[PDB]
Design an enzyme around this catalytic site. Sequence first.
Site, PDB file in Angstrom:
ATOM      1  N   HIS B 274       0.838  -1.190   0.000  1.00 47.13           N
ATOM      2  CA  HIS B 274       0.000   0.000   0.000  1.00 47.13           C
ATOM      3  C   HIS B 274       0.877   1.245   0.000  1.00 47.13           C
ATOM      4  O   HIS B 274       1.801   1.337   0.800  1.00 47.13           O
ATOM      5  CB  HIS B 274      -0.914   0.017   1.233  1.00 47.13           C
ATOM      6  CG  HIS B 274      -1.954  -1.055   1.221  1.00 47.13           C
ATOM      7  ND1 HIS B 274      -2.422  -1.649   2.370  1.00 47.13           N
ATOM      8  CD2 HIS B 274      -2.616  -1.637   0.195  1.00 47.13           C
ATOM      9  CE1 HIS B 274      -3.322  -2.563   2.053  1.00 47.13           C
ATOM     10  NE2 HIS B 274      -3.454  -2.578   0.739  1.00 47.13           N
ATOM     11  N   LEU B 293      -4.081   2.148  21.191  1.00 43.67           N
ATOM     12  CA  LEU B 293      -5.459   1.686  21.105  1.00 43.67           C
ATOM     13  C   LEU B 293      -5.824   0.837  22.314  1.00 43.67           C
ATOM     14  O   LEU B 293      -6.896   1.018  22.900  1.00 43.67           O
ATOM     15  CB  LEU B 293      -5.654   0.902  19.813  1.00 43.67           C
ATOM     16  CG  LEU B 293      -5.628   1.717  18.511  1.00 43.67           C
ATOM     17  CD1 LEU B 293      -5.250   0.805  17.346  1.00 43.67           C
ATOM     18  CD2 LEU B 293      -6.965   2.380  18.272  1.00 43.67           C
ATOM     19  N   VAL B 298      -9.705   0.195  23.432  1.00 47.05           N
ATOM     20  CA  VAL B 298     -10.042  -0.635  22.283  1.00 47.05           C
ATOM     21  C   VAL B 298      -9.686  -2.082  22.615  1.00 47.05           C
ATOM     22  O   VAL B 298      -8.722  -2.355  23.336  1.00 47.05           O
ATOM     23  CB  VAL B 298      -9.268  -0.125  21.051  1.00 47.05           C
ATOM     24  CG1 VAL B 298      -9.458  -1.039  19.864  1.00 47.05           C
ATOM     25  CG2 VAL B 298      -9.688   1.287  20.698  1.00 47.05           C
ATOM     26  N   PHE B 299     -10.445  -3.023  22.073  1.00 46.82           N
ATOM     27  CA  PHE B 299     -10.093  -4.431  22.222  1.00 46.82           C
ATOM     28  C   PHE B 299      -9.051  -4.778  21.160  1.00 46.82           C
ATOM     29  O   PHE B 299      -9.374  -4.843  19.969  1.00 46.82           O
ATOM     30  CB  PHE B 299     -11.337  -5.310  22.095  1.00 46.82           C
ATOM     31  CG  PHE B 299     -12.352  -5.057  23.168  1.00 46.82           C
ATOM     32  CD1 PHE B 299     -12.238  -5.673  24.399  1.00 46.82           C
ATOM     33  CD2 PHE B 299     -13.387  -4.162  22.964  1.00 46.82           C
ATOM     34  CE1 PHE B 299     -13.155  -5.415  25.397  1.00 46.82           C
ATOM     35  CE2 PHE B 299     -14.299  -3.889  23.958  1.00 46.82           C
ATOM     36  CZ  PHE B 299     -14.192  -4.515  25.167  1.00 46.82           C
ATOM     37  N   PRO B 301      -6.212  -7.531  19.945  1.00 47.43           N
ATOM     38  CA  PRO B 301      -5.662  -8.867  20.148  1.00 47.43           C
ATOM     39  C   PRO B 301      -4.153  -8.807  20.274  1.00 47.43           C
ATOM     40  O   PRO B 301      -3.511  -7.814  19.932  1.00 47.43           O
ATOM     41  CB  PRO B 301      -6.078  -9.610  18.884  1.00 47.43           C
ATOM     42  CG  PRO B 301      -6.128  -8.541  17.827  1.00 47.43           C
ATOM     43  CD  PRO B 301      -6.622  -7.314  18.542  1.00 47.43           C
ATOM     44  N   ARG B 302      -3.583  -9.925  20.739  1.00 47.51           N
ATOM     45  CA  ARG B 302      -2.134 -10.035  20.866  1.00 47.51           C
ATOM     46  C   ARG B 302      -1.452  -9.985  19.510  1.00 47.51           C
ATOM     47  O   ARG B 302      -0.328  -9.483  19.398  1.00 47.51           O
ATOM     48  CB  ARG B 302      -1.787 -11.341  21.587  1.00 47.51           C
ATOM     49  CG  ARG B 302      -0.305 -11.596  21.755  1.00 47.51           C
ATOM     50  CD  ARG B 302      -0.045 -13.077  22.041  1.00 47.51           C
ATOM     51  NE  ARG B 302       1.380 -13.411  22.050  1.00 47.51           N
ATOM     52  CZ  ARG B 302       1.866 -14.632  22.272  1.00 47.51           C
ATOM     53  NH1 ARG B 302       1.044 -15.653  22.502  1.00 47.51           N
ATOM     54  NH2 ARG B 302       3.179 -14.836  22.263  1.00 47.51           N
TER      55      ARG B 302
HETATM   56  O1  LIG Z   1      -3.611  -5.403  -1.867  1.00 44.90           O
HETATM   57  P1  LIG Z   1      -4.799  -5.484  -0.888  1.00 44.90           P
HETATM   58  O2  LIG Z   1      -5.453  -4.099  -0.639  1.00 44.90           O
HETATM   59  O3  LIG Z   1      -6.029  -6.353  -1.580  1.00 44.90           O
HETATM   60  O4  LIG Z   1      -4.562  -6.166   0.395  1.00 44.90           O
END
Ligand SMILES: O=P([O-])(O)O
EC number: 2.3.3.8
Lengths: 420, 324
Positions: B274, B293, B298-299, B301-302
């Site tokens: 991205h 968070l 916020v919940f 996770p590990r």
């Molecule tokens: O490349 P992504 O956005 O589908 O994970």
Amino acid sequence: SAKAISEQTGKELLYKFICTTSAIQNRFKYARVTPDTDWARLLQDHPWLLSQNLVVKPDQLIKRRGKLGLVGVNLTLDGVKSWLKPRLGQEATVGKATGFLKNFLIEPFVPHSQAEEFYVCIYATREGDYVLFHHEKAQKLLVGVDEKLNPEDIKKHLLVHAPEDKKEILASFISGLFNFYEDLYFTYLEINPLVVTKDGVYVLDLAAKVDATADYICKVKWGDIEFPPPFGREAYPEEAYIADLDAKSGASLKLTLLNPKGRIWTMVAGGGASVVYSDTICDLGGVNELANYGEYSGAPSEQQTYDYAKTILSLMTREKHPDGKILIIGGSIANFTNVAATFKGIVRAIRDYQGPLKEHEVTIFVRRGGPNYQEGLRVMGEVGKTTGIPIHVFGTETHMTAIVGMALGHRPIPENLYFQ
Amino acid sequence: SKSTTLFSRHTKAIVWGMQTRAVQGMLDFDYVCSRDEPSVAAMVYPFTGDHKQKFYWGHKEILIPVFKNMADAMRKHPEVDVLINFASLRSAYDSTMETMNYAQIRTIAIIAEGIPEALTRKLIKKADQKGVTIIGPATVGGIKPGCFKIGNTGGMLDNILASKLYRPGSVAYVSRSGGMSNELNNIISRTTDGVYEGVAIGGDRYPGSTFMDHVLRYQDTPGVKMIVVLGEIGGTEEYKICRGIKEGRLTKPIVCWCIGTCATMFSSEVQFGHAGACANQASETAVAKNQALKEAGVFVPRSFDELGEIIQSVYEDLVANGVI
Ligand SMILES: O=P([O-])(O)O
Ligand SMILES: O=P([O-])(O)O
Ligand SMILES: O=P([O-])(O)O
Ligand code: NA
Ligand code: NA
């Protein structure tokens, strides 16, 4: 993505394209040195190297060069050569990145007072571009997306504390700098310091990033612009090859080598999933063995996925590792990538590399869903049978990252879940 | 923030680009959601003359009009308030600016990857002026079970059925990632009563609509009882969730995991797939955001591996207390 450019690249563009009434001094008076430089030819090309004392520094996307002791200031050319002797080709750790100092810039020394030094920076945010100015806590102004930045604007908002006799030249230079920043699609431009003496403006320093997606707009002005790797990494021809594939297509094809000798390789679909798999590998202690980061997505063709996979498979069969190697072929449940077509491309690459893959003791783990994934998983299972390469194939009923713990020996392989 | 509700079972859309597979997938979804009518009213494609394209509504062949010019499509379909733009990166800017000259359009999805950030900022400025919600760029889009599916999101009927995407549950989500949004459809369908609405904001540095934009919509939607955010290294958007909880604006349970924890262990800077996924300051790392968070309530996770477990635990607590 936004990509850093060298100081030399940024200055070349600035000197060519900036418009200002200010008299910028020493335009194009820089000289690049590497471990291969022939000093006689360097001097043939830049006779000004003899004409006054000099400043030498790396130009390798290292920041804080002065505070690192990496700027040699007010040196003769012999003094520069002496300064380079222990440094050129040397290992350097900066922060936590480790690389070799192999690219330096020489420029004329400019005698000046501390009062003649200024700081200018422009950088992008969602709401526009901030312009920072400091005489030497900097003055700062948001320039909105549709706003102009004229010299009178700079005087009003930024130069309140600037020496009166320098406001006109500073405002002209900064206005021209901002227009240049916009026209060449910069996202970050820092000059630290800008010097203004009685003789004009000198750009002593530059760091910058450009939005590399704007090549289709800017290529006439950018030319064959170079985006160096970050300090602490090398650039590899396999990366350039994948980047060229990426440029040809709406599909996304990305590859970054982290450790060519690592025994853990990934070939994961998606910008998201590829990161998650990398996270899981590192959480299980594999960071020093993770060879690559990359992904393919956006419905590449069988041929694109073949060219991608053959690059990976070549890369992972360059030298043996005592414990063999692992290939993680993972992904989300795809929305529209054709899993049969893409996995047929990978399978074709696996067949072409089956000898080397067996010689290098590669084990392959697969998890994928999406369009036609059942046939994709079938051809993966079949190429394992026909080549004798061990391949463990999982579908939508296996948690996405479960194959990482399997591959690294932290959990058993659940054969009751194959192909589902 | 902008409109609370973007899509309904009456949403009609124009699709820019010759994307017949994506349109047919939308229609397959529309049909099993028991919509009265196809969600795609028309297509715009300047490389052909006006014509009608064959599609299927169940077993029945139907015709959807394709226009060379956007002005003809809009004029003939005033019922459309959504445009899904599959233009290439080269012309996505111009065609999205063009779309926003039509007051009927209140939401635009922008699919293409590779639009320059400075162009997207101009799109955002115009959309903010007009109150138009942009989803994207660089996204597959999103999905509102029972109502509307953006383009390729959620795929074909086998996946729509498997993940129960033909009727809404109680769980809303937002992610940058398109692939991982469909993984979330799967996880949420197995751990809860299912997805109410999901949005993929896309991978770019300046998403046309942010995590907080959609979290606020979900907070304000009575049918949503809990919210899942798959965050990501890069930028400081997720701290707005901490702030919204502190302020009492966000009161529904939020589960969040930010991907990119590996970057903290690397010795050099890494640009992930991205465009926006690169931490330019310590505060932008996934580790830093996950910690903030968790400290804000916020919940968290590990790791990603425990996300499903925490979603199911929050869901079961909400059933126990009669919220669901
Ligand atoms: O490349 P992504 O956005 O589908 O994970
Ligand atoms: O050495 P730098 O930080 O002034 O670019
Ligand atoms: O409902 P259908 O598929 O018979 O038209
Ligand atoms: Na591409
Ligand atoms: Na992608």
